[PDB]
């Protein structure tokens, strides 16, 4: 008989180079020598937050007592963006939990124990340097503008909801970073745009997608759900009506197969119903600490897209 | 036989008044009575950070159980900028470690012990109020523009590297604070501008000045050097190339005879070579605490100016 013990894996690959086609962090895993630097049995502490907004998802990691060779490989490439993937689970499988580029790295080795630090960004390089220069005339179909701008961003299309037969009412011009322009189109058309684990997600506010996840005491829930406001401020109201404005909170054992834009079903004894996801935070302490995930849910009032 | 014990001195002088010539904090030390208020044998905690950037270097200080007369002298002059100097060393000498103006001061005396607080700025008054209004035509030598703007700033010239026979390509106009205009000229010409302990330093990025300091176990080093990135973010690269982009970290016993723009030689058993300095932080606890200095080094790839 065994116990139920945690497991994880961390991989470091070649520098990421942006080209003239969508970037996939998967293909950069292999190093010039072939197999990548894998780190399994070392105490690790990490925190990974995810959201549906302009900003990329960022995660922090700490590793104790790394071998000198690995640290040397990171002393080099300090000018470059190494690709990194993280996996976690329970002794039988490990689900992808983050993938991005090493934004920052530093080492402090006071006496007894060295402590390496990381800051990782989910597509930070693309979202902050992809320039654009486009224009359109009166009568252009809005569905064409959306596709044109996304292709400029150079990322795979996770999911998109086209506008239909919508047409521009006035001439438009777009410059600067493509991400910023798209985030502005979100406000005026009730659409949510956010990149996550390399995938572009374009959806409509208020509406939600089946029960892709069910939460219950069998599903490793942790404590009862509690109602928490989804924003730190309140807006004036007429009392688009379809927009968000309500939510709840839940916690569960670590499970990387969840994304901010997904949908979950809450099977508890007090609260029951369907909710959207709005925010994720993954925490982990291998030898000591939690191994759980926190979800911020938001009520929905739109159509079932 | 003795031990190796710490010593320090703190001096407070007359209010600083800016005039029509370079400001020297040295000449304001003497008070109307003559000798200044010197504080030697009182537990003191201080933190002084220094850098090479637009912002002035600021340091914090705390003193316990001050006499009522001294506190009274600071209750007055609360509208004025008193000049302050700080010294530290080891029982045989004390090197100047900071000099500036008292930006802030507050007193809290709950029951047993009063605790005075200070915030000091290195040339804050000059850098934030020196206005300018200048213009030049096509063909003007850039070396003339630089000297004209610095004289406006009203500070002694610590060190400057002239541009040679460079000439303006387009007409230029400058207004507002002189410091801001100079900091903009830095970006477009690969030059570093930063005031420190009253001295103006204008140098060129990438290049460095002899071994003015050597670090080794004999030189009171504290722990091994570790590689740390010199910035909290990574820039996109073509992979001016001469710019910085790499660095290291070291710690040493308190030594005020060091400046951000200097050069140091690192004689350790793993790392060996020459580095620039980029950042300093001086910490100190007289009765209890550290008495060390931390240096952030940056690799260089330019000519040996």
């Amino acid at each position: 008989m065994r116990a139920m013990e945690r497991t994880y894996t961390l991989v470091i690959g070649r520098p990421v180079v942006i080209g003239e086609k969508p970037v996939n962090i998967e293909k950069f895993a292999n190093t010039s020598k072939g197999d990548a630097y894998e780190i399994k049995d070392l105490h690790i502490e990490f925190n990974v937050k995810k959201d549906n907004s302009k900003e990329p998802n960022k995660g922090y990691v700490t590793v104790y007592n790394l071998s000198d060779e690995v640290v040397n490989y990171l002393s080099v490439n300090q000018r470059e963006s190494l690709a990194v993937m993280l996996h976690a689970g329970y002794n039988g499988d490990e689900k992808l939990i983050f993938s991005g580029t090493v934004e920052y790295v530093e080492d402090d080795f006071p006496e007894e124990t060295r402590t390496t630090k990381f800051i990782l960004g989910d597509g930070t390089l693309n979202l902050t340097t992809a320039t654009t220069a486009r224009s359109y005339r009166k009568g252009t179909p809005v569905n064409s503008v959306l596709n044109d701008l996304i292709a400029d961003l150079k990322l795979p299309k996770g999911r998109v909801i086209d506008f239909g037969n919508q047409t521009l009412q006035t001439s438009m011009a777009f410059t600067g970073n493509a991400s910023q322009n798209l985030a502005n189109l979100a406000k005026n058309t009730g659409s949510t745009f956010s990149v996550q684990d390399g995938a572009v997600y374009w959806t409509k506010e208020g509406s939600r997608f089946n029960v892709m996840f069910e939460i219950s005491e069998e599903g490793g829930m942790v404590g009862t759900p509690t109602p928490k406001q989804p924003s730190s401020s309140k807006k004036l109201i007429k009392a688009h009506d379809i927009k968000e404005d309500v939510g709840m909170t839940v916690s569960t054992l670590l499970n990387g197969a969840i994304l901010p834009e997904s949908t979950v079903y809450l099977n508890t004894r007090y609260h029951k119903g369907f909710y959207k996801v709005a925010e994720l935070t993954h925490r982990g302490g291998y030898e000591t600490g939690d191994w759980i995930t926190e979800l911020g849910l938001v009520e929905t009032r739109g159509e079932l897209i | 036989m003795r031990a190796m014990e710490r010593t320090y001195t703190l001096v407070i002088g007359r209010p600083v008044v800016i005039g029509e010539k370079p400001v020297n904090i040295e000449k304001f030390a003497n008070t109307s009575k003559g000798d200044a208020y010197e504080i030697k044998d009182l537990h003191i905690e201080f933190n002084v950070k220094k850098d090479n950037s637009k912002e002035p270097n600021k340091g914090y200080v705390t003193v316990y159980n001050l006499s009522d007369e001294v506190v009274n002298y600071l209750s007055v002059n609360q509208r004025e900028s008193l000049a302050v100097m700080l010294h530290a060393g080891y029982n045989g000498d004390e090197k100047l470690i900071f000099s500036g103006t008292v930006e802030y001061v507050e007193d809290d005396f709950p029951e047993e012990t009063r605790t005075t607080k200070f915030i000091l700025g290195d040339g804050t008054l000059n850098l934030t109020t020196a206005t300018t209004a200048r213009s030049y035509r096509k063909g003007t030598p850039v070396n003339s523009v630089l000297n004209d703007l610095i004289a406006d700033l009203k500070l002694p010239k610590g060190r400057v590297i002239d541009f040679g026979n460079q000439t303006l390509q387009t007409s230029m106009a400058f207004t507002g604070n002189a410091s801001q205009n100079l900091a903009n000229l830095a970006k477009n010409t690969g030059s570093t501008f930063s005031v420190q302990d009253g001295a103006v330093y204008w140098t060129k990025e990438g290049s460095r000045f002899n071994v003015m300091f050597e670090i080794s176990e004999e030189g009171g080093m504290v722990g091994t050097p570790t590689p740390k990135q010199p910035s909290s973010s990574k820039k996109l690269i073509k992979a001016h190339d001469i710019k910085e982009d790499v660095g290291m970290t070291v710690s040493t016993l308190l030594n005020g005879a060091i400046l951000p723009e200097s050069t140091v030689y690192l004689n350790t058993r793993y790392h060996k070579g020459f580095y620039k300095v980029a950042e300093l932080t001086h910490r100190g606890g007289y009765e209890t605490g550290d008495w060390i200095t931390e240096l952030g080094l940056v690799e260089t790839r330019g000519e040996l100016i």
């Binding site: 800051i119 | 820039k235 996109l236």
Partner: peptide
């Protein structure tokens, strides 16, 4: 003990600086 607290405050400041300054060609 203030040593422990200063470290956490420093790390939070570092995270905020990273959030403000990131990516970009300049």
């Amino acid at each position: 003990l203030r040593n422990m607290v200063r470290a956490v405050v420093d790390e939070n400041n570092q995270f905020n600086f990273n959030m403000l300054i990131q990516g970009g060609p300049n």
